[model samples]
Target: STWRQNTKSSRIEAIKIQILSKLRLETAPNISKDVIRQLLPKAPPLRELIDQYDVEDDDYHATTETIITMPTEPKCCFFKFSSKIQYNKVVKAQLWIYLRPVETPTTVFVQILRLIRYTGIRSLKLDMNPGTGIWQSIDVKTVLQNWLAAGIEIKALDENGHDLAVTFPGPGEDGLNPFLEVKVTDTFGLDCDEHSTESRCCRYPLTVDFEAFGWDWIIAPKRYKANYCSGECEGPCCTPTKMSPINMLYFNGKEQIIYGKIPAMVVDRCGCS
Candidate 1:
């Protein structure tokens, strides 16, 4: 959503003008390259990519489908999207992703596309890409169930890709969704029923490192807690807590990153005690 600016011609509006100019068949009228550059640093690299293609080549403005296959047991989990889909005119693109877990039911993370203008040229799309880290990896069934209970509708898919409309069964109605519950007893060799056997029901947060600029692996911490039978676990048991800082990673479009930093809330919530 666009926020109001101090003046009638908001910074967001100015930026949007700059972005439209950058993407136009011809450069925007009466706008300076310096103004465009100030608003969008990644434009130079992206412009090159846009210049090479003929936008009029097809009826579709731009359409790209990428298949992302995620491991079943990921250390961290989140999805990342292609930067190419950052235009105002670009409508919808389909993403075919497969969640392959050895014995667990495949979980999917679907993100609908919408654009929010940060600056004219620089925009922020939703973070729908479930990464290969723990921060985004959640109990799929639980999330879906809770969402349904709250009247927030969701669609479930079968192996054949048929949409199962909002028919959430009770616990044990169907077999336990394996992806919903991990084997704390069998895998950890501890009885999770007794509060004394805390370690069996214990879950520790893991931090996964990713290279934003090619070689610099920034560690991003994720919070995970027990889903044991007792329901007496410590930590943010049901809440999806942030266990690390929000490091900012800049994308220059060409080469790699510009810079980044950890958000204050991230540090406050996930910082070491």
Candidate 2:
């Protein structure tokens, strides 16, 4: 984004005044309508799949215990969602659960599995090296596509069918429960567009490439869309040119980003209170 003096107005800045021009420029405090504007027919619904009570209900179990006699040591768990997945047009699906380590260790790497009995299949690995024994997610798109509803089995095992020792927490007050959630990308997102994953401010794009601009002044990021914002503040205050702080919570920890203590940021400016 190019630097502009506060005394000067920007073309980017000019476009903004009109966006709110209808509002009382002299004095006004004001506020997506139509039911469809707020409609979200595509949000994924979480299906908790199964738990202790579910396993006990199986005609095969046919016993009254904690539903904990899984493969004997009570580690691996078999669960099924009480209800069906609730959205159509598959965007993707995930298996969510928390693994509480029976004991603390360096790391706990386990596997995601589902064994459909009678095919001679013991344990199927959907994803391996799952958790360090805490909340984690596994891509169940492949398995879900195949699940045309079968029970889920999460376990730690060896090629020899030897069970690895880890624990999949069951549904309880702790808020950790195994779940299956499916979402659809069939409809356009209706929410106000946001910048980055952390910004609530209004945003727009700004392309930056040092060499192209003959601005051969800075470093790498040789070229990028360093998006800028005009604003999103409301109520009895706010205006353009006010720099605000934003956390550079980039890539959700998937990709690595190294920055000085300041971190990835765009002070730019925005409307807000």
Candidate 3:
């Protein structure tokens, strides 16, 4: 039997022991990974919708609208979101509006100044009762993407050239309100896999190819299963929770201090800082 084959197959079962030795606390034993795993959070939506509210504040009709001091802009939507947005994780950004009266089977045109004036992004078809208001939505993925990835007045125009107004959730308004919905792939999982993406914060396998380093002189783990961290927070914030130093000797020895006594340590758990 080849020594290398056995080591590779059983993984020499060495990494496991190394992890156990390195990750235990000063006194207590290493925590049971399974129990810790059982406490993991619930699965998130594949692409979750993050609600971005419109201006801290809408109505309908022609002659009825003309007298009401004429709303400056029917749907002048203002939005603000305070979070580190992972733009690449974004899939859809939709804008929802409530239509009180769809008397003439109308189409809604929501546009912005484009900082250049009257730039039409997209429109939505209204579906509701003549007396009761219903919600309508249009895709504004591009708009929000622009902000995350600044200013322009957003206005909504009706098929007949009348501006449609919607409500803002607050004070008294309940379900009918204008808001932006951003769908993002913010979901996370516990299992590690080989098919990894930069957008996700997860573990991927890393084999230490001794040959690559002319480390052939170190005879034992011709190669090893030392996984490296990868993913979104590739930020330094995502370092291991535990660490230890290997009394790395056997190299050019002298008293100053050698890098030998140090080896990569492992962590019992990981997370974003």
Candidate 4:
């Protein structure tokens, strides 16, 4: 009886070995214990890896938040609005990584390449809009060209232009990865558009632009969710409210200087007559 029990245990162990062998064939081959000991201090659980070291970058990072303060306020002044319509306004700002001089061109390029290789950068984002308090979007070509013109030697890797990557957010994760989040504030104006006379009541139109680079070989569609709204106010112009502005004046596809405009009717109402 003892002999039979031992035989069954041996059979069960043999079955486990068979299963492990099949699994080993399906997955990557096992590394030798010495190799593991040398490379890693200890093998932790998957959760620990995700929590501690799955992805981390010191050089590449950004922070975004809403800003309520504008150089100008969104209100109708006594002199400008004969009809009482106020100028609709919005403001969004962000701090992003920009190119900084590090070493020689070749060395800097090598550093960038190494950073990408180690961090697995996959894409870059560029903004083009000029100034409206919101950060302007810049054309990728112009941004790249500007760098090239400045004597940087980087080039897009693909015939279709692969070095720069621009993308919009996806629905589910709100265009955000597990690593980052973006926030935008309500739209506010600097004051009613002044048409009749010279006054420093309102802010001049403004826009800012930026770019993001990707390490594509490592990840694709590193999607992040964001909230961007622009355009004019449909509600009571005088009352203050928060909104997502649809930047009607913004041009995302090309590079150009953004300038401000004054409504013709407002000028007409100011009674130049």
Q: Which structure among the candidates has the greatest TM-score?
A: 3
Q: Evaluate model 1: give its TM-score.
A: 0.16
Model 1 lDDT tens row, 1-273: 111112212422443343334333143234333543565445576455434333213432544443232213312222333232222222222222222222223443333222223212111121222333111122333332322232111233434454322223335324211121211111011232222434322222222222321212111221212121222334533221232323333333343433333332221121111
Model 2: lDDT of residue 31: 12
Worst 10 residues of 3 by lDDT: 49-58
Model 1 stretches with alpha carbons more than 4 Å out = 1-203, 211-237, 240-244, 248-250, 254-256, 262-273
Tell me the TM-score of model 3. 0.36
Write the residue-wise lDDT of candidate 2 on 186-223 in tens digits: 31111223233433444455544434633221122334
The local lDDT score (0 to 100) that residue 22 gets in candidate 2 is 27
For every candidate structure, what is the RMSD over all alpha carbons to the true structure, in angstroms? 29.3, 24.9, 22.2, 35.7
Better of 3 and 4 by TM-score: 3
Q: After superposition, how far is residue 221 of candidate 2 from its true place, in Å?
A: 63
* Residue pairs of candidate 2 with colliding backbone atoms: 49-80, 49-81, 156-164, 230-270, 231-270, 231-271, 232-271, 233-271, 233-272
Candidate 3: tens digits of C-alpha lDDT, residues 108-190: 66553434345656544443335655666667667667766533344556666765555434454565556666666543223
Q: Give the TM-score of candidate 2.
A: 0.28
Please give each candidate's TM-score.
Answer: 0.16, 0.28, 0.36, 0.13
**Off by more than 4 A, model 4:** 1-3, 24-30, 40-273
Model 3 ranges off by over 4 Å: 1-75, 101-116, 125-128, 149-164, 167-172, 186-273
